[model samples]
Target: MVVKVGVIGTGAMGRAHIDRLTNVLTGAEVVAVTDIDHEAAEAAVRDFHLNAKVYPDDTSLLQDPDIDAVFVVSFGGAHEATVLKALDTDKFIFTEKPLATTLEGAKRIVDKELTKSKKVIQVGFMRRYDQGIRALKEKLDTGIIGAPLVVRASHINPNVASNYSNEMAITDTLIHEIDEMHWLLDDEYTSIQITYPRQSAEVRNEGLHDPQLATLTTKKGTVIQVLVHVTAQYGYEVKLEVIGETGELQLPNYGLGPILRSNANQQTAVEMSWINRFIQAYNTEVQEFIDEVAKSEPPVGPSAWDGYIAAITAAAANRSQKDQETVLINVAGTPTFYQ
Candidate 1:
């Protein structure tokens, strides 16, 4: 059975998913595409040579009963309503992170999804599906590393003037590593604190701070420090080193070898952006979503609750940045509906 998709965004990432769905995957088909930029939407159908239609708006696309799944990859702000509306239409949804920019919005969607049903929300935390991270998780599970003690992650970029802020630093950039670490350890982040480095002239105005450090304390007292440098100005690169009681596992840059056993003394290659860094991850996750939709069940990947937690974490970290205090992150109990 084909999983018909109605994509609501044709941005770079949206096109990436559409291209892959059209060219790189099976059991799925792009039935239609839409964007605020109508030309961009039509261009996707043409560029990908898709036998699909272009709708004027997301609501028009969402109302297409032929579409069994929706990809809410437009602007993040459009996410909450699209998901709430899509849920009512009887389809699976694969949304990019931050189900909502705020926790309140995410909770509303979570509340609705939990009420009906067979969990169908899959979030775009693509790192969880990456083979390299998967291998590291496999090694850690063997107890050769003992219990995880610390996670050191670096999410640095070439610094976009428009995309950097104390808040975007947490919500847009750090949120990826934030969700990735949670999946990596299969643990919850109990508390998160954000600290800023000295403001630099090198840091652009739109950028609130560079070389920011966030300390994530897990439920088991395991500490994870994610160092974020929006103005790294070198390249888009992400690195991870997990220190366990017995040994350490590091993601040795961009490679398919799965870096847990790299011995941590080598440098791999740097990627241009997440597009190059995790394209295969996106491919893998889309295929996974197709399989889940085929089975008519909730996806095993990141869920709406995961989005809720990430939103909560980002909010807490943003508060920490503003107040200069280690604010405690709070979350309500998981509803039995989600369970």
Candidate 2:
């Protein structure tokens, strides 16, 4: 069956979704789109040559019966409202990460989804689909990395302004690591500790430190360390390593295929941004969403429960940063839908 898709928000990420849906994915069509910016929406519609209707507001787009699934790619702050709105229609939804800015908001949405007795929500945790990461997971399952005892992940980006501090490292970025680590180890974090260092001169203007660290201990006694360097001097970088009793499993840097040296020692190609680093993962994620929606099955992406856990852990990390002590996460009891 052909699934009709709707894209909300017309920003760079949103436009990327439109392009992928129109060009890459099969058995799905962009039937409708909406954005507060009408001009951007019109431009996207015209560029894709889609006969889809353009709605001025999200409510209109959600009301369309033809829309089988919706992609929520609005600003991170707007995610909660847009996701709850889509849930009200009982349509399948593929939401961008963080799920919601606050744990309380994310819990409410998860509860509502559980009440409906269906799996229609898929949180965007694309790293789980990355080829290299998937290979590591396979190795772990095969016992190549014999019983993992520790996991380490990092997300490093260039400098940004002070306003970005509103979302701490845990909420804005580290939550991805939290969710994926849990999935990889098949365990939940039992404790969290956050450490912050002084900002470098380059990053001081942005009111952010050079690098931030989060240490997580799981219920099964496994430890995971996550480093989020939002103000690194170099390009974007993400790395993951799992240490086991027998051997280690690692995901190599995506763009570090080789080094070219003529005038200077330089990497031939490097991912300059998150988009460049995880483009294929994002494409696979959206295609999986469409495929699952067409089959009326649960999504392979992160679940509502995963979102709840990520939000709760992020809140704990934020509290730890404030209190200068280790903080414990308090996630609500899982519902039947999660089973």
Candidate 3:
């Protein structure tokens, strides 16, 4: 039997997931949807030609009897409510990151799931679903690369919106690394510090930091360096290099096909949009959610606890950025439920 999915928030991400659930992924049907912008929600239903009902709001969509699962693709602030309500409704949930806008909100979701003693929610950390990343983790775990000592990562974007500010460098972009690093290293960060280097002269956004460096130390004493350059003007690229005791491991760009060479120049396209870069990951992420929900099993991807950890770490990172000093990440260790 298929998982009947309902969508909340029909914005860019919402529509993208609708596309996947309706057209790309199997064992899932987009049977209902809701958004603050009713017209946009209706448009998505019509645009996708979905045999779905457009509800007036998320509550209505979640209440639909045919909806066995809900996708919490609404804005960051609204995620907590939808997810908490989904938990109470006992429906499977797949929520996009920054699971909630605040640490307290994320903790509430974690607590709710704990109280229920059922893992019905999965945070949308799509990077974990990337096959290359999965393989990288598998290889690293095999000890083939030896002990991981340092991780150097770069997250570059062609540009950001006019409203993108310094804080988003950590909250929006670097947030992915915050979560992935933890998953990859299997270690919790002990402290983090942020330093700003030369500002890009071509920066167009007001108050936007061009490139920022974050140095994080994990409990195992592994040092991690992350570079977040939102206005790199070099297209979107995510690079990761792990310095191991015996060797090094790096993740390659996916679907790059063949290199192009002409006029004594060699070049290949760089993805300008994150959606294109992680398209397969997104597809796999949602497909797995559908598969788990269809089988009446708890979600096995990033969970509420992971979101909470990311939230706390991100807050500390922002504090480090603001104070220009190292900030300690006080983690209480993973709870048994999460383990």
Candidate 4:
């Protein structure tokens, strides 16, 4: 059965998913769409040449019986309400990162899903689907690196928009590492400490800080050091290395476009955008969601519980940044429903 999808936002990410659902993936069709800016929704339908109805608002689109699933790509702040309402129906939903802006909001979404008695939501943590990261996970799970001890990771972007803030360094960027580390090591974060290095001259925003270092401790006594640099200026680069009892493993760079040899220097090109770096992973992530929807099965990818954990961890990191001291994260134990 084809899974009819209704997209809640028509922004860049929303339009990208619409293209994926309509053009790139199979067994799914975008049947309805809505955005705060109604014209954008209309434009998406016209530009995609989709046989879809443009609704005035998300509520109207969600109520459309023809939509068997929904993609909640609206702003991060609206996730809690939209997801809770989406869970009201039996339709499957895919929400973008942060899950919700606050820990309480994230917990509420998980609680709402638990009441449904069946899994119906998949949080968008596409790194889990990245081919290189998938291989990294497979190798680690094989016990090649016995008992991961410490991890060093980086989330560096060439730049961010003017509206970006210091808090976003953790919520928007480091949150990915938080979730991926949890999934990779099968451990929960116990505490976090954030320290700001010398601010970058490229950092123009008064409210923003560049190059923050976060030290996170996990339940299994694993230590993770994450470097989040928003003004790295070279290119978008993400790296991860794990040191275990026996050896070490790292994620090699992918999409290093052409190697240049000039002026006694050999330079390999790095992707400048996250989209370019993980486009295939995004496709695979949504394709799996569509595949599960077609089979009437729950999504097994990043679950709402994982989203809650990420939100909590990000909040703790933010607090540590503010307090300039370690902040203990008292995350609720995993519920049986999620396990």
Best candidate per TM-score, number?
A: 4
TM-score per candidate, chains pooled: 0.92, 0.93, 0.97, 0.98
Better candidate by lDDT, 2 or 3 = 3
Residue pairs with colliding backbones in model 1 are 119-298
Q: What C-alpha lDDT, on a 0 to 100 scale, does residue 78 get in candidate 3?
A: 90
Per-residue lDDT tens digits of candidate 4, residues 1-339?
Answer: 789999999999999999999898889999899999999999999999999999998777888988889999988998788888887787899999968999999998998888886899999999999899889888988998899999999998999998898998888889889899989888888999999889899998887878999999999999999999989999998899999999999998666568889999998888888888888899999999999988888998999999999988888888888766999997888888888
Per-candidate clashes come to 1, 0, 0, 0
Candidate 2 residues 39-155, lDDT tens each?
Answer: 898988999888799998888899999899998988877889889888889789998887898999999899788778578999998888888889888889998767889888888
Candidate 4 or 1, higher TM-score: 4
Writing each residue's lDDT as its tens digit, candidate 1 over 103-153 gives: 899989988887775888989988888888888888888999899999998
lDDT (C-alpha) at residue 125 in model 4: 97
Model 1 local distance difference test score:
0.84
**Per-model lDDT:** 0.84, 0.83, 0.89, 0.90
In model 3, the worst 10-residue window by lDDT is: 251-260
